[PDB]
Design a protein around this ligand. Sequence first.
Ligand SMILES: [Zn+2]
Ligand SMILES: [Zn+2]
Ligand SMILES: [Zn+2]
Lengths: 92, 97, 49, 56, 56, 149, 99, 56, 65, 237, 119
Amino acid sequence: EGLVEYIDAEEEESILIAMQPEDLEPAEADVDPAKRIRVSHHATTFTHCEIHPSMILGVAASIIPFPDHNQSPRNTYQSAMGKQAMGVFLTN
Amino acid sequence: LMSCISVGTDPMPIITFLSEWGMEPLEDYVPHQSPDATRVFVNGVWHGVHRNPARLMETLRTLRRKGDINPEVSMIRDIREKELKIFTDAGRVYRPL
Amino acid sequence: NQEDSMIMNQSSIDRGLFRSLFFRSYMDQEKKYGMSITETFEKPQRTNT
Amino acid sequence: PHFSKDDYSPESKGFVENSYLRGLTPQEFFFHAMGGREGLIDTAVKTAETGYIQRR
Amino acid sequence: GPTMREITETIAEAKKKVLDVTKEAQANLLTAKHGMTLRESFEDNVVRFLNEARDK
Amino acid sequence: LEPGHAADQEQAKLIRSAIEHTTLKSVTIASEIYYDPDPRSTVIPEDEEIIQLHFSLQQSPWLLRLELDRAAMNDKDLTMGQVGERIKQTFKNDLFVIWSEDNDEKLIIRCRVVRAEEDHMLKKIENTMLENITLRGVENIERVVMMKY
Amino acid sequence: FNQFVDYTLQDIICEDSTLIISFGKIYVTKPMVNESDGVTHALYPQEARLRNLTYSSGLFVDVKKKVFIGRLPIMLRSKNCYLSEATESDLYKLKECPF
Amino acid sequence: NGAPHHAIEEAESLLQFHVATYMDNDIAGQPQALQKSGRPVKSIRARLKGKEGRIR
Amino acid sequence: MIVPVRCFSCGKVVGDKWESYLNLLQEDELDEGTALSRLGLKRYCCRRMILTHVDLIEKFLRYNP
Amino acid sequence: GSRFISTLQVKLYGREGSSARTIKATLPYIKQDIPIVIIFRALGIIPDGEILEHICYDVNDWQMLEMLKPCVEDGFVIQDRETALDFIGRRGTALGIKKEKRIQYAKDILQKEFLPHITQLEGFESRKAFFLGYMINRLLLCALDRKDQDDRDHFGKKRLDLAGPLLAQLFKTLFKKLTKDIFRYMQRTVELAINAKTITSGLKYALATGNWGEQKKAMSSRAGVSQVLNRYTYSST
Amino acid sequence: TTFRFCRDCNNMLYPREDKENNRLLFECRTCSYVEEAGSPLVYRHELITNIGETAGVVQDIGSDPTLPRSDRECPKCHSRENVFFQSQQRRKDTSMVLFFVCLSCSHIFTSDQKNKRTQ
Ligand SMILES: [Zn+2]
Ligand SMILES: [Zn+2]
Ligand SMILES: [Zn+2]
């Protein structure tokens, strides 16, 4: 239906991606203090939009809760430990 | 999580398509005649040249989006470098957007 | 619980906290050295050497 | 690819505006991960290099 | 809350101090430091401001 | 710095200038070879003024012309004559050197060879000029910073 | 794996093939076990794991002037694997974990 | 026996190889004297060569 | 595996409360919050006991013998 | 198919601020580096100006052209196709005097081993001479500080060989070894029976040991390709 | 500099002095051809370069999404529709000056305040 496309790193060099759809599509003509400080949708040349930024992560780091609230190496360590863990690995 | 690796397409339908959509063969290239001409590369093979790449890209992009060109095939246009690189190539890492 | 060590609730450990199963599988084969000559799975006993 | 070309801004070249409490943005998260990884390597490399220095 | 307001502002004013230099260098008005490229000079100031910022 | 000179920044600047290595390459915009057959006249009309003077109070028809950067000369506080004399002593009586004054719109150094197969020689001279020649400063001492310790 | 078995495998046969004797269409059987005491029967993954067998299938090529070439180890849940076209209930019966 | 003298020099080179390769098998720009397995063969040298040698 | 007999932390019996928890969710169409509370699982130690339990036994049973 | 990685280097001799900055290229099975201009004439592009047009696509780019002025001089001593091929063939070796040997050897290398992608077919000189030109063009653009030196680490210029291409590498090796086994049985036929084990056991060894190389004598061969699946946690799998 | 080739050869031309008449000539070394020169300039170095500065200014420049945009009025059409870059001359010492291209008149203009160019 051509609403979604496959983009490698070589092609990525020719596009311009928006992070969120909604927070990166209209334009300005209050703000929550608690929330993190975001950038802008000022680009009128958006070709593609990210499905979800959390898809930058792989299996291991995807089990980390709030990894955006940790120091980067601490996440690298928990990525390694989830292997040294225990539980049901299969029902059979 | 969303990463995938290109399995390997056939370059021939694209090469056959390009020549039929404005691609001059390399053997007939005259640089003094076509000095602004965009170089068309398919899997690191300089097949020839294109005089209006703009339209060619428009055609190729929507050809792939329709599925007529495999969705795993990568096609880039570096306007500044006067180049159009296409990859049918197996082994490339891609993501969906 | 100093320097990356921790105290655990003994009462909870009993009630089944973090208790795990462990399995190990040992394996063997009756090898056929040459022809007719074969290894035998049996409970052995003190016989010659 | 989320930025325009020739963007020298604090935001583009990896300045993490946020605190850990507030949480990092996707860009912030990656740039942090880039610098973070350089740490882990440099540590790995120094553990080796200092090892031999001690022995010699 | 007010201390957070003060931080958000501190970061903000530093970002502007950076832009002011970024435009100054883009307008070829920025004079290079002795034994430093215009680029080397600009980048030095930027990272000095963005650090001064984090520290404050 | 010398004991009774520690406070003086100008003394410090002087030494910085005296020790920091400077090449002809660093002050040159571009190097050009022309065929100017008459040493008394010039095909290049800019130099029409430069010839008239350096010919008041036999040579190669091939000319090597160097344009120098005012800005580069200013950071390294150099004179045209300073640069010129340095070229003069590098080739002695084998190269004929004329140069524009520190006022003239374009900073130029004109070179003709002294006394078959001559053009190819000037390209060798232009390499010795940029690559080899040292204007001021000590070799290896590449960047010199001033610090108030 | 699927790309290799379907396409690549036929190409490797037909690129040097013929001699002084040509190689034709390659046929890829479903996983089996060529054992003594009997002949051959279909081999399902759980059996292969326990009995320490290789989960591979037959390779056949038509030789001109059909022919067994060897055994290709099959990737689990791939086109040629039995589990690929098997339901949740089939796996549980097959002692295979649905997950 | 019937020494063809250019078959004698052949067997002598071989004896030189095995006596060389016994003491040091990891010789500069020469092939390794590998086992049946293709396994390189422990030279007496290699036995004493450090970190795990007799010495270290 | 199967619903633990009693809460790890305080030892309140949660062994009986499984089938009944599941009926409150399914048949009564209640939310987990009110369901746990109706069964009288007051402290969060007891709530986490039932709320967060994975009844894998049901998957294991699906295999033949 | 094939799998023959012959790498071509187009070198820019002489450093920044060195006289006679010449361009030579690394030819497969040719002992010495050949000046670009000789190659073009050996490909049929003989007048220095046709050679220049295959390299610099703009006559207003005096800068790039001044860089090719020494190349033309380097090649000037060779003026026809035969002279060019013989020059290359001499640098290959074998004292093959001359026409049917030296020259034919060079013809063969240029067709089969020089830029093996494009085509290994006969008449594709135009194609190969333009590509060599594009390489020199890209080279000079860098030497002239116009384009940047390539990022050897750009992920887009990297490939990951998965389960399939890895099995393909092995099948080619084994089936070609089987072809040799078949060819030995035919020669032995002084006048069926083809070893099926070679393919079965071959793939078995590699997937077992993880030593991607035939078959007990796997050194130098890639080790740790095939490793036992981790099963501590579902996520660790 | 300019590049001239020998007709009847298409080979490169080398300089030669006509000592009798004091004039520059370009001779062919592959044949008997000779022609008078056009300019006395034969060789040019350019150590501090300005050529490559505004590379790849294709008329499709505007269709590149990666390129940033500005609302500066053009020195020609006064259209507040632009696309800009800075380098293109990938040297170390390079200034940070911006090069604006108009999506109307197609003319290039610099943010340069110190220098006063035309291209
Ligand atoms: Zn409790
Ligand atoms: Zn001629
Ligand atoms: Zn305009």
